[PDB]
Subunit: 461 residues, 4 copies
Amino acid sequence: GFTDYKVADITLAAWGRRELIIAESEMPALMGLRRKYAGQQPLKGAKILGCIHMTIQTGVLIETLVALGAEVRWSSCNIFSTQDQAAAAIAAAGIPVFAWKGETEEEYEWCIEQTILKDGQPWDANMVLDDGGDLTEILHKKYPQMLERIHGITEETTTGVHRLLDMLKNGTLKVPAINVNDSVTKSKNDNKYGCRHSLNDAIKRGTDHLLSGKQALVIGYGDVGKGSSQSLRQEGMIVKVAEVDPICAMQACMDGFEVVSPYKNGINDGTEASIDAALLGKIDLIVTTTGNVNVCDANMLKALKKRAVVCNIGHFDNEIDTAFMRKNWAWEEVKPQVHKIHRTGKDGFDAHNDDYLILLAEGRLVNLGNATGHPSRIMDGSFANQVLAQIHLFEQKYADLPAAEKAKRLSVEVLPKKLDEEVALEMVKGFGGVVTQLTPKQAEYIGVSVEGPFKPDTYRY
Amino acid sequence: AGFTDYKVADITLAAWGRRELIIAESEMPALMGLRRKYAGQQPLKGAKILGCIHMTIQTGVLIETLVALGAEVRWSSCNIFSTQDQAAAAIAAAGIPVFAWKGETEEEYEWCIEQTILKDGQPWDANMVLDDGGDLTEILHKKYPQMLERIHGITEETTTGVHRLLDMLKNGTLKVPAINVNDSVTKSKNDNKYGCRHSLNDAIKRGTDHLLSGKQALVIGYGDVGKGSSQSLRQEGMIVKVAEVDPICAMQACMDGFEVVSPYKNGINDGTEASIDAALLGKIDLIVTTTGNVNVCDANMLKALKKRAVVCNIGHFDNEIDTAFMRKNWAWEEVKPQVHKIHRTGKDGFDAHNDDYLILLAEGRLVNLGNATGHPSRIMDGSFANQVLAQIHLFEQKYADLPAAEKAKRLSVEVLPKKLDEEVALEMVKGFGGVVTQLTPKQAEYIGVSVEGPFKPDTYRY
Amino acid sequence: AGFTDYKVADITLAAWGRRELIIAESEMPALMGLRRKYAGQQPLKGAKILGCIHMTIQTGVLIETLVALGAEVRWSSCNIFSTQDQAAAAIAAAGIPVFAWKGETEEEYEWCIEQTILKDGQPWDANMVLDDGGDLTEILHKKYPQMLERIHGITEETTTGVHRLLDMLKNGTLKVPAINVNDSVTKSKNDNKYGCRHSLNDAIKRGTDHLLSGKQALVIGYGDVGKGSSQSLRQEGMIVKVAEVDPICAMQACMDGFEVVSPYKNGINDGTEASIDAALLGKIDLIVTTTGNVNVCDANMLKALKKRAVVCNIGHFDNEIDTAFMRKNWAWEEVKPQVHKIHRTGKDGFDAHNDDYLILLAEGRLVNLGNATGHPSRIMDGSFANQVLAQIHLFEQKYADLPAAEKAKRLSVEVLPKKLDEEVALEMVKGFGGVVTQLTPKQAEYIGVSVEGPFKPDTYRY
Amino acid sequence: GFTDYKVADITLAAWGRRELIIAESEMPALMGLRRKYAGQQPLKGAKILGCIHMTIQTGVLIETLVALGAEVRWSSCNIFSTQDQAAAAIAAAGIPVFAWKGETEEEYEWCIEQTILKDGQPWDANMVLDDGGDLTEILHKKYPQMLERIHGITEETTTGVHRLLDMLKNGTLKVPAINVNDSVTKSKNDNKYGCRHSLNDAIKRGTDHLLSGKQALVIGYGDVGKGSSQSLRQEGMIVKVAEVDPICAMQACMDGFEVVSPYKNGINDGTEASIDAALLGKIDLIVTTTGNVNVCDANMLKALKKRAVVCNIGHFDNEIDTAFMRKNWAWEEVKPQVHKIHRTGKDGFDAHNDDYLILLAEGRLVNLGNATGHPSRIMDGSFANQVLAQIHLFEQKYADLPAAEKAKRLSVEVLPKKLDEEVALEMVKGFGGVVTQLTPKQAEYIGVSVEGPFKPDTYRY
Ligand SMILES: NC(=O)c1ccc[n+]([C@@H]2O[C@H](COP(=O)([O-])OP(=O)(O)OC[C@H]3O[C@@H](n4cnc5c(N)ncnc54)[C@H](O)[C@@H]3O)[C@@H](O)[C@H]2O)c1
Ligand SMILES: NC(=O)c1ccc[n+]([C@@H]2O[C@H](COP(=O)([O-])OP(=O)(O)OC[C@H]3O[C@@H](n4cnc5c(N)ncnc54)[C@H](O)[C@@H]3O)[C@@H](O)[C@H]2O)c1
Ligand SMILES: NC(=O)c1ccc[n+]([C@@H]2O[C@H](COP(=O)([O-])OP(=O)(O)OC[C@H]3O[C@@H](n4cnc5c(N)ncnc54)[C@H](O)[C@@H]3O)[C@@H](O)[C@H]2O)c1
Ligand SMILES: NC(=O)c1ccc[n+]([C@@H]2O[C@H](COP(=O)([O-])OP(=O)(O)OC[C@H]3O[C@@H](n4cnc5c(N)ncnc54)[C@H](O)[C@@H]3O)[C@@H](O)[C@H]2O)c1
Ligand SMILES: Nc1ncnc2[nH]cnc12
Ligand SMILES: Nc1ncnc2[nH]cnc12
Ligand SMILES: [K+]
Ligand SMILES: [K+]
Ligand SMILES: [K+]
Ligand SMILES: [K+]
């Protein structure tokens, strides 16, 4: 008589389970952690609040935490990223989950709250797993007392890490965190190669547009912008790249991309005259990858080529000024998460109007909103890091320290390189790759152990 | 004219070298921007720089920027095959002491370094060191320790040199502070990677004129050089396999679209012939070493390689390949300079029509510099703008003149601050005609940076 | 008002389909340009076209262009899984007879074709055929020969269909002339190649959401479909090997940077398990058949494949893969529509956690259409602009009205003239915003062409 | 005491012979024919005038013809394309060759004349091998009596085939020809993949310029244009493509290139006003690939970005208006086959002037002028076709046939597809590739012999 959940349709659980069984075969690092730690039950007595996209891959993460001894209560960190069959399979296994594809904002907040409250009262949670910092913010702001019991937070993504570092700087962070994002087997795997796989996937599913031969503008060239640019270039798009960071812009040039600004002289003074109208007038697709605010702004949207596609693969939808488009332009739904935005006015639209843009996932994370985000074999790296970060903080028991010792222990850290290498080795073996073992003389020659770590902590890969 | 303090192959190549220098200047906007920015201030007035780095046209622009900012220099190459003789001639013709030519012997290489160190039989009054690989740094510390008493710092170009500096620092044997120029992003992630992408397939074509498309390559290593090298071959249509000891680098190779393999069965290098994956090596048309490690293409691998395979090294030192084994056992037939056929049929003589040979490029020395011209000027612009800034910083710090307590606080191996890395990058991007967008105040506040940068935390890996 | 002459999955999908048709029209400038150019002239007035081709959104734009030009049509799909139900619904809601849904049985497939042929239980007075694969053409010749006496021609979309026409021609059994639409350059070297480049990895992602980067693929065939398929996988970072029986196509694969391998030791398929290269197939994560041939992924290959390999086919017919052997011997577990795990453990049931299975996509039917949406509108633009021109040409020639002696001289399989192929291509280039340069009169004289084209001899291969 | 030659330096012969021995191991189709036909001596009695780039690869072709029984007398078909060590090895083998790198135009014509004449009188030639049509034209216009004895012409390249078809159309072709260009193992190997290998090769040797991130304009997108665009794009150039043929332009778009015209709206009206100055002012490299005349004209040259590189990889230098540049601008030699062209005027230049273009090989074929042309393993295909074509036309013995039989055979033809396939098969095996053999049922199913040919003659690959 398990009822402690809310999903779109529980009858999808058998389908969800079939896809979980396939995903386990694609996630050797994660499944290897189940075998390595199951006898030891290192998460026995852990009670984890989880807030991350309720996909099949998150399903395998959740069941790994449970196989290692944890109880969890789960929600998604985006209104469109849940795969309903994954949420169903998790609920049907007796696990509290509150997530469905197509939540309203109010439902999104309610879902987080159902993880935080059990039977109307704060759950006795002692760990947090977060992706974007929304659950972390709600606990700090609305349930600060619960953080007196919590041993740490493991944060998945760049945007969430920034918010943790803000709190650390301000002295408002109450528990230590692991920056899971900055493991190499996360940031340089998930953020880059994951978006390479899933950006053109989402655009094809949403529009079925030919990309070859067409003009794209990618805003940003960090890890997600690098992966996004490659996703489009390998399809034969002519890709241009915008950046505020000259080092990242240098890499885009060397990678064979023309680097341009939406603005004359690169100066964003807020006027229409600042827009390079010739440039925007040729662009068939714009993709925002920055984690910043309003990098595809109202004047850019006004200048864009008719029938251009607009989408965002950064964590939050405020990269694009969708508010301006809601206020001024008429939205025509093509199908779920695909809207034609008619620039002729707000008062209805001509069904045969040519002057529209196509917006994907209402500006929300497009790879998860219009497709299924990253594939299992990539999320294997990210989620093996999450499990190890959860064990790492849970075994250190920060919440049991006195305040003076807590202050010394409070930090936002990355996992040590030896663990990053262990995850990577399991990923490499999953491809059938064979890593070479150094001889003792060679290890001495370059100053490393035969067992690693193989690089100084300064190394950038 | 009057000035004889140099040794080059052919001083009559100077006009040609000057022509190429004027072109390279147009390809190096960050370096020429520093030249214009600092010429009036002469921040290197009174600097006396010992420099040891490949005497190419690009190094010529570096040398003349240091001189233009007030420095005196004495120069040698850090490799026996990497000098461009017309670049060396142009520098000597400018009145600048340089001891470098393409095709030095080992003894001549050592002699050239000593000629920078000594002027008229006695130690020059050097006070700065610019180095690439640590050979000059090592000679100073071992054979001329008294000279380091007046030297304010070393600016070290490459990964191998940095490793050597960090070991000396850990051992307490490093006598002057250093700047790790290699780990500026506009060096490591530009020169080490994209420079090898441009220049590896360049050198292989010049040396052999072999079609690369459709053939099988084995790249040993997948760090910055191995990454760029693998791409140099893959973009030509080679079927590239990658070897690594680092599972993170190996993961990157898989995700980049390469099969990851080991020359040894199960990756276990026990020194036996039986440990060689003979089936794998018997299919390889080209092997490239990129590791900075020792004996990563060993005798048993050389024995097992496909007939007529090409063997080369693009790491700093030639001991990546066991060329000593090949000198001891196999007959060498020079095809042309820096290209030898190595006949595996025996030591004394060869059949001119023997089919069982390998082709070795540059006798195992850095192949991009030995068989072509190394990295192009527009890439070396980034590396050498960092060098100029590093020289300015350490020279103005004046370590040799500080009290002992201050020396102890500053005796370290550091990178340049990220703000300077970004300033070099910005000039490189402008050189391509790229335009960097300026953050609005609100956007800068949103991501927690200054509008002027730095734009990333020091943890960032790019 | 009272239109019932159709059969689709769900007529209420029509508004959705119309929204997507309006979008597709903006992606199909060559086809809509033909609609605008010819609509006033009504060149297809009196044409009664039997159409058998994948009932996609792209085919909807084709259908409505034929109707806009004056034709009546009766339509079916040429594959049981390729229909987009919202496209079929929009076409039916427009009062156009269409018999098509995703997930037909074979019996329903034949029934749908027969519903186009018969109107109110009697042969429709058809006078034109548009076909993709030859099934409609074969049913007409075998079962309704009297209908062909009134048909002016067949316009055939695809390589396999053209092969069937040329067999009939050589055997003396073809009853009406045909245009080979496939071999326009704006079809064959657009649709067959670039279409599969877009849609193969699309369909694999939708069916499995597998990572492709770093995994091993075997593509059987390197014609136009195999070239486009190989690129679809390689651009994702797969390690792609290619099999071929044609040495010229194999040479192209080598030069394009692929290893060319055979499933059979030394390429010799003697029908035994012993001839299978077990080591090679045991490494393969994905096999794709592209040949138009029979049993190129056979039972012994399926037995040898790596556990959990994906198997699919993008040639026209499912007999490229021996699925019948798999139905006879192994247990099928449906993951979701058009995605099956095939458990090699036995026929009677399976362990839900068995590791020894293959994933078959679309039951071996055309995978890009079965698991995704086939080629994108802007590619199908070229193919379907050729179809419209071919229908106009054969309809206006009026073969069916000729005396028997003249029918014999006119009975042929021809391609469209190069000038029309160029005109389709020009509208496609304009759709991308490309600007084609115009020759000066002196340049046109220098290379021996008219300023307006055609620009190449008919021998030219592009 | 053999002296019937003229080369730069006979002392280079040992070096040339070393490179020929290597090249033989890279040319299995050609060396396989050499071994196959040696017993039969199919070219016994053949006396071949040859005019083709005197490279190491041509050396292996020459010695194959001689090994099969021919006598030859040889010249290069370009003033810059000879490898002097190849010419020396051929001469030192006792084979008449007249060729060196850096001929004058007068010397070029002298060298062809030295193959035509032996001892001051027309040689008793009976076969012609040509690349570009210059020898063919001199024979028809200056030595027509010699054509009465000649059985055929085997012509290497697109430009020469066009000239042969123009002669045939006008009734002036005196002997039959085989169009070697249009074997698939020549056109879609040599013309495309050869330029992919050797174009960026020649630009690097001439300028050592970084190509990644810079802007290129390739004029033409036929086989040479396709290969050239790939040569630059695989280095990271941003490549734009110009074409007059809309089908070729369509391929460029689908291949991921922006298609542009040097002229506004594509209309070349001869005035500066028609130039797209904004476009040409951003171009770092222009490469002409057309076989046409004046496709990089004076007005384009005036408008190119300062310091742009200009080069031609079509057969003749008139693709670029070098005559305009000689008349108006000052040329500064950087090194052989590399000139700075100073747009500041005719009479002298400032050595530090910034307003120059870099011209490679004085506008002559740049892959052969500034590097070594195509590599051996590519030329293997072209030159195996040359040998087969020479055997075919020599055995047909056209010069001996009665007039009505000559009339049936006076044509320009390609080799049969079966031979094209057999050449390709040897190339594939050179890579270690394994071709699959059809079963009898599969051969029957697609309507081919198990031995091939596998494609109809209509097939375009
Ligand atoms: N959708 C996904 O699956 C996915 C995966 C990982 C991360 N993310 C999210 O994507 C975002 C980017 O992540 P990242 O790891 O690439 O961060 P990053 O710091 O590596 O890159 C962001 C880049 O944006 C640039 N940028 C900032 N403001 C800009 C502006 N106005 N114009 C142009 N460029 C600008 C920065 O210079 C930086 O290089 C974050 O929100 C992260 O949480 C999404
Ligand atoms: N030729 C050039 O122009 C040039 C340019 C830059 C650097 N370098 C030199 O190249 C070398 C590599 O430099 P880098 O920056 O790439 O260093 P790096 O540390 O980034 O990469 C070296 C890689 O080699 C791998 N490796 C070590 N031993 C191995 C073995 N036995 N088998 C396989 N892989 C092994 C390591 O795991 C590492 O990832 C250094 O000697 C450096 O100074 C040369
Ligand atoms: N799914 C799609 O959207 C789509 C698009 C166009 C065509 N098609 C179909 O795809 C098939 C191929 O079309 P195509 O235009 O590429 O034909 P093609 O003739 O150009 O190529 C088929 C290739 O298969 C090779 N081949 C034949 N038997 C083989 C074997 N046993 N092993 C290996 N290679 C073998 C042939 O040598 C040939 O090169 C046809 O059925 C065609 O109708 C499908
Ligand atoms: N350098 C080499 O090694 C090499 C190799 C093979 C052929 N070639 C020569 O290269 C030339 C091209 O050969 P190909 O086989 O590619 O010929 P091709 O006919 O396949 O291609 C030439 C292309 O130029 C285009 N073109 C013509 N005039 C143009 C103009 N004004 N603007 C833009 N595009 C224009 C044509 O439309 C055509 O597509 C010929 O001279 C040939 O002899 C050189
Ligand atoms: N498939 C996925 N599952 C969970 N988090 C993700 N982030 C990006 N892709 C994801
Ligand atoms: N290397 C080469 N030898 C002869 N002709 C060629 N044409 C192109 N490259 C050539
Ligand atoms: K997924
Ligand atoms: K260089
Ligand atoms: K579609
Ligand atoms: K060559």
